[PDB]
Paper text:
The structures are T = 7 laevo icosahedra composed of 415 copies of the MCP gp13 (35.4 kDa), several hundred copies of SP gp11 (23.5 kDa) inside procapsids, 180 copies of gp12 in DNA-filled capsids, and a gp6-gp7 complex which forms the specialised portal vertex. The asymmetric units (ASUs) comprise seven SPP1 gp13 subunits: six in a hexon (subunits A to F) and one from the capsid penton (subunit G). Gp13 has the characteristic L-shape of capsid proteins of other tailed bacteriophages, with well-defined A and P domains, an extended N-terminus arm, and the E-loop.
Procapsid II has bulky density for the SP attached to the capsid lattice interior only underneath the MCP five−fold vertices. The hexon becomes less skewed in procapsid II, more flat and expands to a size of 16.5 nm × 14.2 nm with the central opening getting slightly larger (~3.0 nm × 3.7 nm). The transition from procapsid I to procapsid II is induced by major structural rearrangements in the hexon subunits that become flattened resulting in expansion without major changes in the pentons. Subunits A-E of the ASU undergo significant conformational changes in the P domains and N-arms during transition from procapsid I to procapsid II. These interactions are disrupted in subunits A–E of procapsid II where helices α1* unfold to an extended strand similar to the one found in the MVC. The A and P domains of subunits F and G keep a similar conformation in the two procapsid states, correlating with maintenance of their attachment to the SP, while the E-loop moves outwards making the overall conformation more flat.
Author numbering:
A (entry chain F), C (entry chain G): 2 to 324
B (entry chain A): 56 to 217
């Protein structure tokens, strides 16, 4: 058909392009990390492959002073040690196309299919991490200091409960940046409050703002239902700075192959990456595997945290939607 | 029609002891149909020379603007075709009949957000005069006079109005 | 091992050779026209396809003659109504070899492999035809006036009943060209009439002839049986001049691939064409698919047509063999 950079498969000149555009286009960003610690490098790249390491830490000395008084002596004190974990995950999928369609629309090879696949993974992470918090951080007594709800049919989501939730970190404020928002909410928001369209990029328009924050319109969210048609939403609020990840490399990032007896040709991607909040430690219990983790069971149960209280940093409030 | 898109049905966990399989792509199944029209009209003659002018000229220099109202005449009809009698499009129509609600400040929001994630994919608002009268009584419709010089392209919320 | 214009697969210099040699070798011809309309090329070669575009019919006659005169209008040449459709079919197969060297593949790979393909791939054509044509008359009323029998206990198939069939073409007589047949008939012929081997070209060889016609012979034609152990034959008569067909092309008419663990290599052809009577429109009723169809389904039912009587042009008559 054409020069076919992918269909005659130049593996160079292509894969770096795809990865980078995948990074910039997707947002989030930021919010979350850019270029996390090389810790996740040593977990990602070869050599010393996964699964994940464990890294330690020394909590700070603490204790009372003692009465300094003669005719008595002192007693010394000690330090402790602690543990931390991460995970590693793998992904991939195919494409069933016929090169007739792929470069039918594609035509000029460079921008077309690359831009597409980029936009693809851009949504993929947005699905995976946003699923990663989901069960864990909500289900425990251990985080409850970070969850408050107005639910059970008195609460409005406006102008007050938002503030109080935003102060659920007592001393530490003004580290928070982005507000995760499902659509219908922000609908109820434009219906009432002052939510203020702010134009930064000159000249471009614009990312919406609530109060010195960046709200984020996001399609896929949790939602539940009770009887009596009453609804409940989640809408995480963090803008922490940050989560973390590092890209890492597989072998054969791009592969082109075809089948003689039928008529097809297909594509594959299969990228590695390492992402996890630091944040709670990860463990192994009562799960399948391994590795990588999962989706479902990579959420449903069994995480364990140690810091604790501050510098997590994420908070959730389930609120009912305004009448 | 030359449709295009990429995304499907994801995602899948890379592991040995399994194979990936592909996922099919929506093809060009979008379909349309050619239409064609026309007409013709005569004159008189002896009436032309007897009237003190020529009908043929005036009619012939009025021919151009005729086809506009035809084009509109098709389009309105046709859209009114898509949305009728189909539950398959129903997410795009919002019926405030049954005698409450005026078109102010809310049902407008319902419209502009009825596309859940995608907002500001809309620009101009179709309107009947008397309505925007009922708007300018209450509503905030704000006059940005920008094109030098023109009066005026009204605006409600980062939109245009026609 | 060899020059291997197929194994190292030069797409030039081959496919055209295939198609041409196919046209010369297999016949028919004529009978059926060569080089039909190129709107069919729009059917195979994109765009315009889909289910098969319609072919016009052309001749000059309107009601000749009309009275040259004065004080009288002539009135014009009018085109009677009509419409039709067709099918469009896609076929192919593969071929196997082995690594224990059945080879050679001589000094002319081109003509060797090419022609040896042309034999087969040309030969299936007429099988598809008769298979199909068995469908019009199969059991249908609207063609009844184009079928005739002298059969059921008296007919000789010689010199007269044939003249009846010669009436059966409604307007046009002595437009006959070819005669379908089955062998035993033309045996009885050799016993009776003058059916005459006639060298056509000087010197080139040669078409068996009834009367200035090219007879065609194949073993597959309907043969049914009443009680009393006697046989009934079909032997279509058309010699319309003609049916029609045109080609178009897919992508990759020639392909070469191999197997790894097992020891093999394979070839494939896969070309498309459009051929049918005109004749009847082709509709989708109680018929699987799609598209193309089948042999069986190309038999079963659902052919309805508009002319009616003339420019069909095919006639069948069932009769007893000489006794």
């Amino acid at each position: 058909a054409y020069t076919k950079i992918s269909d005659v498969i130049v593996p160079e000149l292509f894969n770096p392009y795809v990865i980078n555009t995948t990074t910039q286009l997707s947002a989030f960003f930021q919010s979350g990390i850019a270029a996390t610690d090389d810790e996740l490098n040593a977990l990602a790249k070869k050599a010393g492959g996964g699964s994940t390491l464990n890294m330690p830490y020394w909590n700070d000395l603490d204790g009372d002073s003692q009465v300094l008084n003669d005719t008595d002596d002192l007693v010394p004190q000690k330090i402790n040690a602690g543990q931390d974990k991460a995970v590693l995950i793998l992904r991939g999928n195919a494409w069933s196309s016929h090169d007739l369609a792929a470069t039918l629309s594609g035509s000029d090879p460079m921008q077309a299919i690359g831009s597409r696949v980029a936009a693809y993974w851009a949504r993929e992470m947005q699905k995976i991490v946003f699923a990663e918090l989901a069960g864990v951080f909500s289900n425990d007594d251990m985080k409850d200091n970070k969850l408050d709800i107005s639910g059970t049919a008195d609460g409005i989501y406006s102008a007050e409960t938002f503030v109080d939730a935003s102060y659920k970190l007592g001393d530490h404020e003004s580290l928070l940046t982005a507000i995760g928002m499902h659509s219908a909410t922000m609908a109820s928001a434009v219906k009432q409050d002052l939510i203020e369209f702010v134009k930064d990029s000159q000249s471009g328009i614009r990312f919406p703002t609530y109060m010195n924050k960046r709200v984020i319109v996001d399609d896929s969210m949790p939602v539940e239902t009770l009887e009596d048609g009453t609804k409940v939403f989640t809408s995480y609020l963090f803008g922490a700075g940050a989560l973390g990840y590092a890209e890492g490399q597989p072998e054969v990032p791009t592969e082109t192959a075809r089948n003689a007896l039928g008529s097809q040709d297909i594509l594959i991607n299969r990228k590695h990456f390492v992402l996890h909040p630091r944040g709670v430690k990860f463990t192994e219990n009562a799960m399948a595997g391994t590795t990588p983790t999962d989706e479902e069971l990579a959420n449903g149960a069994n995480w364990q945290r140690v810091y604790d209280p501050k510098k997590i940093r994420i908070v959730q409030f389930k609120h009912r939607l305004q009448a």
